[PDB]
Amino acid sequence: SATSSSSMILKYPYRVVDTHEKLKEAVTSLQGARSIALDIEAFCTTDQAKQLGRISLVQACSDAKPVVFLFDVLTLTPDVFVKDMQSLLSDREIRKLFFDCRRDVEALSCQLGVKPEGVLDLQVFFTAIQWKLRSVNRRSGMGYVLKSVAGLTRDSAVQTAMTLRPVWDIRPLPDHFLEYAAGDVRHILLLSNYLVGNKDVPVDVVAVERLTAQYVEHYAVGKPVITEADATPAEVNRAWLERYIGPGGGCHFCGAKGHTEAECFKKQNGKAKCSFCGEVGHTARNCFKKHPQLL
RNA sequence: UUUUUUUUUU
Ligand SMILES: [Ca+2]
Ligand SMILES: [Ca+2]
Ligand SMILES: [Zn+2]
Ligand SMILES: [Zn+2]
Fold first, then answer.
1. Is the CB of A232 under 7 A from strand B?
2. Any idea where the domains of chain A sit in the sequence?
3. Own/partner long-range contacts of A233-238 (Cβ < 8 Å, ≥24 apart)
4. Which residues bind Mn(2+) 2 (predicted)?
5. If you placed Cys at A272, which of A127, A197, A255, A268 could pair as Cys (CB 3.0 to 4.6 Å)?
6. Are strands A95-98 and A119-121 parallel, antiparallel or unpaired?
7. After which residues is chain A broken (C to N over 2.5 A)?
8. Distances (CA, A) of A227 to A127, A212, A221
9. Which nucleotide shows the minimum CA-to-C1' distance to residue A148?
10. Which candidate, A105, A107, A138, A103, places its Cα nearest to that of A123?
11. Considering only residues 11-40 of protein chain A, which place a Cβ less than 7 A from any atom of strand B?
């Protein structure tokens, strides 16, 4: 099951790929994959610049090996790194899994001259589900998607230097920077087990692949993107959702957009209770007893 | 103690 498979994936060690010898081995491993989760860490810039800064790490985790590769592009140089990786990134027969591909794909194209093919954006997948059920086009962050899809609740000094300096320029990278960089692709690969090939997910993977391909066409143009595809960063263009996914949904009980029948305040009519602690006024997903980290 | 309760990526 996806739940037991998740525990294995979360134990995958990282491996820094920072020499030509290490790179050849990593490429050979990824060459045998069917799906490769990808992520990028880049030099932090200023708030105004939307483009990623200079690529520092490209992270990969595939179904071919229980490891997270941390490609040290800064040390290898882009020229060395892209030599054989470009063919794999361009191979439509290997699915590349992202969580918000937009900035990543822009950086791959601008900085590396590579345009991936066979891409599936799991953040978009999750949004497309919310769109079909509720006419919601919000992009949710990794933490929210992890909790809602896999029930998982997933470091500091990295966030301290980051949110508040390039950050990712220092070499050697401290262990906790490497582990920080390693985390997302583990989560991406495990999330794919829940979202992809799940008969009971109500959006077709092919539809989301096509929608993701549109994002790659928009953002992988060999130069910084002028006009964003989404009206604000934390949403998915409604017109693209209408085109690739279909009409947005709403509550079967009251007809409103934004929620489903199972969540309807009107159908619950003041009588619903938290399924964990039993009190009125909140859901199990947001219960402070079940989830004290929400206090 | 709670709302349709959310880190878009870096
Ligand atoms: Ca990312
Ligand atoms: Ca990341
Ligand atoms: Zn309703
Ligand atoms: Zn509760």
1. no
2. 2-121+149-223, 262-295
3. A233/A50, A233/A139, A234/A138, A234/A139, A235/A137, A235/A138, A235/A139, A236/A124, A236/A127, A236/A128, A236/A131, A236/A137, A236/A138, A236/A139, A237/A137, A238/A137
4. 39, 104
5. A268
6. parallel
7. 154, 164
8. 21, 17, 12
9. B6
10. A138
11. 39-40
Q: How many residues does chain A have?
A: 295
- The fourth-level CATH superfamily of domain A2-121+149-223 is Ribonuclease H-like superfamily/Ribonuclease H (3.30.420.10)
Determination approach: X-ray
Residues sharing a CB contact under 8 Å with residue A49, sequence separation 6 or more, in sequence order: none
Q: Which of residues 107-126 of A touch strand B (CB under 7 A)?
A: 123
Task: Give me the CA A269–C1' B1 separation in Å, rounded.
Answer: 22
How many angstroms separate the CA atoms of A295 and A287, rounded?
A: 9
* Pair of tokens at residue A113: 């001259």
Write b or e for each residue in A73-94: b if 16 or more Cβ atoms lie within 10 A of its Cβ, otherwise e.
bbbbebeebbebbbebbebeeb
Chain centre to alpha carbon of residue A63:
16
